[PDB]
Design a protein around this ligand. Structure first.
Ligand SMILES: [K+]
Ligand SMILES: [Mg+2]
Ligand SMILES: [Mg+2]
Ligand SMILES: [Mg+2]
Ligand SMILES: [Mg+2]
Ligand SMILES: [Mg+2]
Ligand SMILES: [Mg+2]
Ligand SMILES: [Mg+2]
Ligand SMILES: [Mg+2]
Ligand SMILES: [Mg+2]
Ligand SMILES: [Mg+2]
Ligand SMILES: [Mg+2]
Lengths: 325, 567, 140, 198, 101, 229, 49, 132
RNA sequence: UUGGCGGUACUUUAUAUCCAUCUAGAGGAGCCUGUUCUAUAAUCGAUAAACCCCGCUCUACCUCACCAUCUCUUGCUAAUUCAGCCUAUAUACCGCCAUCUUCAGCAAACCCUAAAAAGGUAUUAAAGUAAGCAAAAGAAUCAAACAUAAAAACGUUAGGUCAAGGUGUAGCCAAUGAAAUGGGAAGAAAUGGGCUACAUUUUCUUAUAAAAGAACAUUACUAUACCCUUUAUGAAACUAAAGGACUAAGGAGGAUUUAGU
């Protein structure tokens, strides 16, 4: 008994009407955009809505949407009993009919395997589904203790002898682990009008950006912005930074590089070239060497950039003096 | 590129379900409150102009600036009089003109004529306006005309026109005689007013009257004055009085119009139609065929406003089509309205609803139901909101096509147009639905419609204590409930015959009994007997005997039934 | 309309003059807006409109501009506490080529009249003409 | 006793799926939930809630909709607008071909903004660009023309740029730049006695 | 009624400087050069002084158009920081948002 | 200036000073000034067709007009009367019955309990208050928090009755909680011939002794005021 | 032009086409203040003679 | 604590609309701009004049439709045209709206010397985004 | 039965922090700037943390609210025995904020208790439940992350602001209102913050931060002071900049304190 509106819940009759309007919505949206209604799809709908209702709101949940009711409306709002009031599932009164119905099946499988009576690593590089994924399969809220108990039961199933039916079952709750390989992506090897091989790669340090063009065969002649490298870089430390890629792979005096660095200062421009050269030099080295470069810092872009000044303090971190009290 | 939206009201009306005109009254009332707010705003702007004078619009917009109508020239000079004449003030200009004469300062004949034009046209009365007329023998116009030292053709011409406009036909003709005696020459506009005068005056002999009007035309050629469209339009409008004898003269005029080179306008045909197709025409046996020829002549042509009766043509043409019961001609007339921008000459508010009402009524009568329903969606509501009689014609058409499945939908449409509480319409909907039997699905649909029409009676009864349920609707609503799986509701409605003291019909009473036999409920069968006894209907006794044989009556029922039989 | 359709719609009068027409080598249309999505819809509408009239069009996105300024948060004192505000301007350049003067007026009118609210245009016509008759021949 | 008016059902219900939508939205109008037959929703949704509906939606009203501009309308619109367009001369099929016959390039700028005033000060400026190769200039003339114009001449492109914004209107600034070219050209050909002392 | 008596005085200063703009331009031109005799320049130095003080355009102060606040005004909108924040924080200024970066 | 004018909601918010440092830790009354104003009505007395007067009268399309000085003075005085009458209406109220005293809640009817889950109305039941305690505890919200404990009883006068305690921070909430809780704890009391107990009853509940006696008809209820209720 | 806005809106309020919640708020505070005897004195008849 | 344009929490009984619920930092993220003109774009003029005209147009519409506005109005300037889009409660009779539309449009077109149109969407009652 | 604070000083805890570690400063000199004090005919407010380059992203006149002197009395508006009021109370308030604070709580409606002043957890589970607000998430810094910004409820300080504006109550209406002219001064003073120098990792010059040639302790380094010229803005130079000399002190700054991962 409060002014806050009563819980808004959706019946099967309500969602059913929301799906008829959506189906009639598609036929109108198709007629607007001049497309054929039969083939009009979810992808075309989202594109049409973006043209007819251009919104530049940064958060995409707040933009106009004409989606199917299944997506927008919470799925876990379906009638669980009939007209006579008798629930449909024998575990209705537990409050977690779907979680306990699943724990009922897995416990019955375990009993038959134990009564009836090889390597268990049938699948590798897989993980157990996270609670958020499980909650989606069950379509009901689970607690952290409920998730832990389900996994322990599934593990016990794997320990026991498993027929092909059991392996398919546990597969449903095994999700492929992401295979993000931190391995450098080698650039192609183009050919010049003369016919010499060369690779190109970009590099960015602070505000400086470089575009190197390493040549497979050379005597070590580096030209920066159409100038020599001793002239362009009068500082010793800046030249050393250009030496690091080649010296590491013992490839000094074997390549001819032509660089074009714009932006930043003297040190930031040398660093930008170093990464650009290291990435272009990848095409002319063995894969074992490319990994050696990656593990020495030569292929990682440096993310350190100047931080903004903050209002009310002298600098990015420097604070105004705390006046003597 | 764009066409009319069939599901939208006219663009003038605000696009909102709450603000869309339901009926024809709200259509006119909504366009009179809008104009009222426009006039309220212009009053504030024209009364406190200092607040609406800053101009920030480049280029400058003249029509969004305050208007000033009061003279700002204070000195009494011929120039100041000219300002008042330009501003169209009649009394102020007369005062300053007389003051100029009192001083004796020279006044140009052209300026004195601009004063007479204003006075003659407004007939000595201030221009009509809104804020928080026969010719008078003693008036400023005639007095100023006499004071004029030097007279010219225009001066006499202005007097002749102002007199005719303000119903001074006899005097205007006398003024024209003076113009001839002075040997001056009139203009086309003055000749048109003189012809309008002879016609309006009632001459005992038409042959003399016609020969007189022709004499004015003969003096138009002696003075080398060429006629215009209005000249011929005026003559034909006068001929509409003598329908019988004006037919041959009227055709002769139109042939002369083309030879001269004047192009007949929509107004010129509007007059010939009236003269050949009289509304009060007893001789309908053999109507004239001229309307067919005109439509062929005007087929595909585009027309522009060139007279003051152009709008009248389309409304008159549709009327003649309905009288002749020719739907092919109605399509040609409507097709002409669609060519180019002819739609602009359909007519104003009084005549726009007559044209389409006449048109749509003709469609339903003489058009296939499939085509009739296409026109129904196009014209309504976008073009016009129809009155209830339009729906009675539509429902009658549905009945003639054996498509009564659509009667429930027509009712829902009718409610939007303010026919929800119309007694005649509610009686027609129920009548057609319950006139004959139907398949179970159709009967169930009609039953839902019957429930909706019942709610209108119930809600109406709640508002009005002195409410009467007409007898026929009661029978129709009860029958439909029995036939469509709503028998329980029909038994409750049986009591309403007694509450309103309406005499149940013999057919309805026996129908209730038939349903009772299938149900097998003797109690329900005896309930019918109770109502028959109330109104002392003779069949009630026979019905009671019928119940005795139809059902086995318990001893308690025998005593109760016997009492009712005695009653 | 299902059965009721105009018969001979009236069309505007276009009269060919005897004056020669302007020749625009290039015509750059720089539209500006706070919202990128609006530019995408206008970019689609303008590119589709150009293609339908036979005009040659290219599109690129000039770098966006963001202007930031600081204000004082409190009505009184409390200097160190500020509030910052920004305005973002986004650009879409429609580079048209080889347009006569009649084609550039009708196209610009059509797309200028349909310019959404909050969008500003900057047309930069580039006309090409012959040399002045005096300059053609050196005269002393 | 007082009677409150009842709103009619939205006219979207009466709209067919094969309607002529261009007729529904002829020109730019605000989003009208009673005229747009689409179940569109907009708004960040509350927890366990869906985005708000179209009816009474201020966010959808704040959007500059393109319902008036649909692919079906635009094609029907441009079809009518074809009679206005004129054909570009086929011979001028390349940029170099244009420089051959029409060496003079005149830049003029228009500006479109929202407000009561159509005035922009930047619209008066005009810029003339001509290549000296296109001009008939003797070896003496070209050297004199390049010294007089100063930084207006670009050696890399050999283009002379005359920008005139001093006059109030665009027709005056345009006529002035053409004038500047004639005097510079004719003066360059003229030879003065003091020039022999270079 | 303007916001306060200070805004009214400034409004008059702005309307009298517009009246005397041409005059103060022509006379002041005679002084901002080295081509005319110093006797004439000294005399124009006195004609400019003789014009009314409110004709001088350096006595105009930019004040918030809605609250007549002398300082804290933003010239692009002619509003004080306090009034500008009320309109910006409510979505009433077209394109103004908070700066997060 | 027209630009320094604020809305009514903000003007009353400031004047009332409800949210303030003094209010929370320790009289002005709000008024609505648009209550009697009819759109289109001004001091000058202009008449606007379609806004404050009929658009059409006796078939005549009306035009703008203004009321005379005498007519307008009547309208101003009439509205002043209606405003004064509205103030009288605010003062007026329908007196309800007191309980065992005039300033106490004991014995006061608060109506029937609220409807049930499936439209189970309880119009046949009456609710009576027996004790109302305003007790203060010590929570950080106010330092010393506020609490209202309400004991109520319900019965249909036909043998079924129950009691419950409802606690809340607001008295109105404590009434609802107690009133709807008691409907779930309905005892059925056996009455001899519908007017008295079947036999003498003597009992001690904790330190409270009750001693009831069966009596003949017409004797009435001679009992503690709470027992009579 | 602050005079144009203040004057125009004041005129509209007297025609009944505009409602100033602020002014009605002030109009009633003066009415109540005058009843309490704290109303504005007449010019030339102030407390000081 | 920041007090700017925040409808503070009550005890779950205050009905806030979508516009009212979102604080200033959600501008351009979850909620858009009520006025859309070209005067705050880069290298554009007359920001001061567009902002002042909006302030007046908002006070004018409130007084002209007193108690009949369900939410803040939306102002759209295209070329010299001004468009006012307001959600209005269905309190007043229909014909009264036709008067106020004709009056408010004509008056505002002669005051700012631009074409002004009023677009009114009628709601049965204020739309509540959440109860706070 | 609760709430509190007492000496919660005890165990873990903070993370540019309490001490320790590290770097550059402040504390000394010269100036710039705020405040207090003295003081003037001459604003006001802020004034421990959470004031002191604060309202001011800005005072030669204007700004201006201050003081002296002279003047106006229906005195901005359509109307009004009305206009106007920076007049007192931020201890009547709105509005917009500081603070604890990127702290983690605030918790409505129901249900249960051998009566409840209150409480309501156990997961191999024992009476709690299904929803909000903040956090998280999301979005912004235009790949990705991280980081930074932004966000941070309820209370605490009757904290700050009637002088952004609006407003309750009380006060002034020939004056506490309006306008004009000219002033709103200073320091053998204390203190907060900033700036420059004290030099050799330096000074000057050319390049450019590469390299080179000179200077290098009595004025070598070293005056954003005073003074002297020219110049820009302005009606007004009392302002700012650029030169010119004049050049004094200062030789790296006690206890002590600020910022930075
Ligand atoms: K406060
Ligand atoms: Mg630093
Ligand atoms: Mg200044
Ligand atoms: Mg008492
Ligand atoms: Mg204070
Ligand atoms: Mg001063
Ligand atoms: Mg002064
Ligand atoms: Mg004062
Ligand atoms: Mg992110
Ligand atoms: Mg967060
Ligand atoms: Mg004073
Ligand atoms: Mg000077």
């Amino acid at each position: 008994n409060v002014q806050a509106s009563r819980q808004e819940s959706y019946t099967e009759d309500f969602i059913k009407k929301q799906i008829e309007e959506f189906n009639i919505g598609k036929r109108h949206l198709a007629n607007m955009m001049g497309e054929d209604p039969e083939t009009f799809a979810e992808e075309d709908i989202d594109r049409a809505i973006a043209y007819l209702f251009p919104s530049g709101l940064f958060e995409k949940r707040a933009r106009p949407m004409m989606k199917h009711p299944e997506h927008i409306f919470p799925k876990q709002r379906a009638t669980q009993w009939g007209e006579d009031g008798r629930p449909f599932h024998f575990l209705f009164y537990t409050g977690k009919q779907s979680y306990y119905s699943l724990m009922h099946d897995v416990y019955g499988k375990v009993m038959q395997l134990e009564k009836h009576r090889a390597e268990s690593r049938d699948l590798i590089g897989s993980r157990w589904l996270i609670k958020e994924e499980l909650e989606e399969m069950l379509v009901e809220k689970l607690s952290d203790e409920d998730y832990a108990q389900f996994i322990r039961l599934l593990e016990k199933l794997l320990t026991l002898p498993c027929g092909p039916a059991e392996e398919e079952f546990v597969q449903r709750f095994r999700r492929s682990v992401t295979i993000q390989s931190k391995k450098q992506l080698i650039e192609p090897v183009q050919y010049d009008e003369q016919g010499m091989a060369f690779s190109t790669s970009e590099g960015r340090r602070k505000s400086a950006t470089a575009q190197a063009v390493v040549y497979e065969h050379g005597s070590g002649k580096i030209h920066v912005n159409g100038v020599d490298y001793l002239i362009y870089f009068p500082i010793t430390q800046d030249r050393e930074q250009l030496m690091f890629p080649f010296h590491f792979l013992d490839r000094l005096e074997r390549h001819d590089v032509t660089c074009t660095v714009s932006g930043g200062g003297r040190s930031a421009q040398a660093g930008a070239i170093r990464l650009a050269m290291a990435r272009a030099l990848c095409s002319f080295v063995t894969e074992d060497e490319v990994e050696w470069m990656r593990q020495a810092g030569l292929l990682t872009p440096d993310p350190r950039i100047r931080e903004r000044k903050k209002p009310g303090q002298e600098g990015a971190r420097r604070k105004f003096t705390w006046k003597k009290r | 590129t764009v066409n009319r939206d069939p599901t939208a009201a006219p663009y003038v009306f605000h696009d909102d379900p709450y603000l869309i005109p339901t009926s024809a009254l709200e259509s006119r009332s909504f366009l009179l409150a809008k104009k009222s707010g426009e006039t309220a705003a212009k009053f504030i702007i024209n009364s406190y102009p200092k607040y609406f004078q800053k101009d920030i619009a480049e280029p400058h917009i003249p029509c969004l600036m305050p208007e000033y109508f009061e003279p700002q020239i204070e000195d009494v000079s011929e120039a100041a009089l000219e300002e008042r004449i330009r501003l169209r003030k009649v009394r102020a200009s007369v005062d300053m003109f007389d003051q100029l004469l009192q001083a004796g300062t020279t006044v140009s004949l052209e300026t004195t004529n601009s004063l007479l034009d204003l006075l003659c046209y407004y007939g000595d009365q201030e221009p009509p306006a809104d804020y928080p007329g026969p010719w008078k023998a003693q008036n400023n116009a005639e007095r100023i005309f006499a004071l004029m030292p030097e007279k010219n053709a225009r001066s006499y011409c202005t007097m002749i026109r102002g007199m005719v406009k303000h119903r001074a036909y006899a005097q205007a003709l006398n003024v024209y005689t003076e113009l001839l005696n002075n040997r001056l020459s009139a203009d086309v506009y003055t000749f048109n007013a003189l012809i309008e005068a002879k016609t309006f005056i009632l001459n005992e002999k038409f042959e003399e009257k016609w020969n007189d009007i022709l004499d004015l035309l003969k003096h138009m050629v002696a003075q080398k004055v060429k006629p215009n469209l209005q000249t011929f339009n005026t003559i034909l409008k006068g001929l509409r009085k003598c329908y019988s004898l004006g037919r041959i003269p009227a055709l002769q005029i139109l042939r002369e119009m083309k030879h001269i080179g004047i192009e007949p306008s929509l107004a010129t045909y509007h007059h010939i139609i009236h003269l050949f197709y009289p509304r009060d025409l007893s001789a309908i046996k053999m109507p004239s065929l001229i309307i067919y020829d005109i439509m062929n002549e005007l087929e595909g042509r585009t027309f522009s406003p060139q007279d003051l009766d152009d709008g009248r043509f389309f409304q008159l043409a549709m009327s003649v089509c309905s009288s002749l019961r020719d739907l092919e001609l109605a399509y040609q007339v409507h097709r002409l309205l669609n060519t180019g921008d002819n739609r602009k000459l359909v007519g104003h508010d009084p005549l726009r609803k007559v044209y389409y009402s006449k048109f749509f009524s003709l469609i339903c009568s003489l058009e296939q139901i499939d085509v009739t329903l296409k026109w129904y969606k196009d014209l309504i509501p976008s073009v016009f909101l129809p009155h209830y009689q339009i729906f009675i014609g539509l429902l009658q058409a549905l009945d003639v096509a054996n498509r009564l499945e659509l009667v429930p939908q027509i009712w829902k449409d009718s409610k939007e147009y303010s026919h929800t509480f119309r007694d005649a319409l509610r009686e027609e909907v129920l009548m057609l639905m319950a006139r004959d039997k139907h398949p179970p699905e159709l009967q169930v649909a009609f039953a839902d419609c019957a429930a909706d029409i019942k709610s209108t009676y119930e809600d109406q009864s709640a508002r009005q204590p002195a409410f009467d349920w007409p007898a026929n609707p009661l029978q129709y609503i009860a029958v439909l409930f029995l036939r469509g799986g709503r028998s329980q509701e029909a038994w409750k409605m049986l009591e309403l015959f007694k509450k309103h003291k309406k005499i149940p019909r013999n057919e309805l009473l026996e129908e209730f009994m038939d349903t009772a036999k299938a149900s097998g409920s003797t109690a329900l069968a005896i309930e019918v007997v109770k109502l028959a006894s109330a109104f002392s209907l003779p069949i009630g006794e026979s019905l009671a005997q019928r119940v005795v044989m139809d059902f086995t009556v318990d001893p308690e029922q025998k005593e109760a039934l016997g009492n009712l039989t005695e009653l | 309309l299902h059965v009721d359709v105009p018969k001979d719609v009236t069309r505007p009068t276009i009269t060919t003059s005897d004056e020669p027409d302007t020749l625009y080598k290039r015509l750059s249309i720089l539209v500006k807006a706070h919202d990128r999505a609006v530019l995408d819809s206008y970019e689609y509408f303008a590119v589709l409109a150009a293609k339908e009239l036979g005009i040659s069009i290219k599109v690129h996105e000039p770098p966006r501009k963001i202007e930031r300024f600081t204000l004082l948060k409190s009505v009184h004192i409390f200097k160190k506490h500020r509030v910052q505000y920004e305005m973002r301007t986004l650009y879409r350049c429609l580079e048209l080529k080889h347009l006569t003067g009649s084609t550039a007026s009708v196209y610009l009118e059509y797309i200028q009249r349909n310019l959404p609210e909050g969008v500003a245009m900057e047309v930069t016509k580039t006309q090409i003409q012959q040399l002045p008759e005096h300059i053609k021949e050196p005269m002393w | 006793r007082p009677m409150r008016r009842k709103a009619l059902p939205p006219r979207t219900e009466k709209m067919d799926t094969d309607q002529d939508w261009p007729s529904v939205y002829p020109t730019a109008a605000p989003f009208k939930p009673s005229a747009v037959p689409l179940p569109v929703r907009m708004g960040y949704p509350v927890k366990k809630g869906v985005p708000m509906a179209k009816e009474g939606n201020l966010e959808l009203l704040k959007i500059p909709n393109f319902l008036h501009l649909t692919p079906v309308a635009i094609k029907r619109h441009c079809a009518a607008l074809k009679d206005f367009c004129t054909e570009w001369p086929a011979a001028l099929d390349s940029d170099e071909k244009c420089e051959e016959h029409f060496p003079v390039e005149i830049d003029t700028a228009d500006y479109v903004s929202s407000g009561p005033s159509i005035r922009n000060p930047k619209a008066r400026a005009v810029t003339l660009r001509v290549k000296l190769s296109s001009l008939n200039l003797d070896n003496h003339a070209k050297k004199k023309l390049i010294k007089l114009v100063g930084e207006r001449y670009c050696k890399a492109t050999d283009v002379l740029t005359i920008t005139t914004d001093r006059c109030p209107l665009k027709r005056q600034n345009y006529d002035y730049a053409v004038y500047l070219l004639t005097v510079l050209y004719h003066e360059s050909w003229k030879t003065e006695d003091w020039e022999n002392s270079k | 009624y303007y916001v306060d008596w200070r805004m009214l005085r400034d409004l008059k200063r702005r309307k009298m400087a517009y009246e005397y703009a041409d005059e103060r331009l022509r006379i002041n031109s005679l002084r901002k050069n080295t081509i005319l005799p110093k006797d004439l320049q000294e005399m124009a130095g006195d004609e400019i002084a003789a014009l009314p003080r409110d004709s001088c355009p350096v006595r105009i102060r930019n004040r918030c158009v809605m609250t007549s606040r002398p300082r804290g005004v933003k010239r692009r909108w002619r509003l004080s920081r306090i009034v500008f924040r009320h309109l910006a924080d409510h979505g009433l200024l077209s394109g103004v948002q908070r700066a997060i970066w | 200036s027209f630009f320094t004018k604020l809305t009514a909601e903000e003007l009353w918010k400031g004047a009332l000073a409800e949210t303030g440092a003094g209010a929370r830790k320790g009289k002005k009354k709000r008024k609505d000034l648009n209550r009697g104003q009819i759109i289109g009505e001004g001091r000058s007395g202009f008449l606007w067709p379609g806004l404050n007067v009929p658009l059409i009268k006796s078939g005549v399309v009306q035009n703008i007009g203004q009321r005379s000085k005498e007519e307008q003075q009547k309208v101003e005085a009439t509205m002043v009367e209606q405003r004064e009458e509205w103030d009288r209406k605010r003062k007026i109220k329908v007196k309800r019955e007191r309980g065992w005293s005039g300033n106490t809640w004991g014995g006061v009817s608060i109506g029937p309990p609220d409807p049930g889950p499936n439209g189970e109305t309880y119009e046949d039941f009456d609710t009576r208050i027996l004790e109302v305690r305003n007790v203060f505890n010590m929570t950080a919200k106010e330092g010393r928090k506020k609490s209202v404990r309400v004991l109520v009883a319900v019965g249909n006068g036909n043998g079924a009755a129950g009691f419950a305690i409802g606690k809340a921070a607001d008295r109105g909430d404590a009434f609802r909680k107690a009133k709807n809780r008691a409907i779930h704890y309905l005892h059925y009391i056996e009455r001899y011939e519908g007017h008295t107990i079947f036999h003498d009853i003597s009992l001690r509940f904790k330190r409270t002794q009750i001693r009831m006696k069966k009596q003949p008809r017409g004797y009435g209820l001679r009992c503690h005021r709470a027992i009579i209720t | 032009n602050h005079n144009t806005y203040f004057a125009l809106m004041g005129n509209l309020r007297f025609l009944g086409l505009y409602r100033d919640e602020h002014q009605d708020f002030k109009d009633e505070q003066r009415r109540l203040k005058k009843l309490r005897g704290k109303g504005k004195p007449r010019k030339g008849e102030g407390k000081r003679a | 604590k920041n007090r700017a344009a925040r409808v503070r929490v009550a005890k779950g009984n205050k009905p806030v609309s979508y516009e009212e619920a979102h604080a200033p930092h959600y501008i351009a993220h979850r909620k858009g701009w009520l006025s859309l003109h070209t005067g705050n774009l880069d290298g554009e003029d007359h920001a001061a004049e567009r902002t002042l005209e909006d302030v007046f147009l908002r006070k004018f519409m409130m007084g002209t439709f007193p108690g009949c506005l369900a939410d803040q109005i939306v102002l759209k300037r295209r070329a010299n045209q001004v468009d006012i889009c307001a959600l209005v409660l269905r309190q007043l009779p229909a014909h009264k709206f036709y008067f106020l539309v004709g009056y408010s449009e004509t008056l505002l077109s002669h005051f700012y010397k631009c074409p002004v149109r009023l677009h009114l969407q009628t709601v049965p009652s204020k739309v509540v985004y959440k109860y706070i």
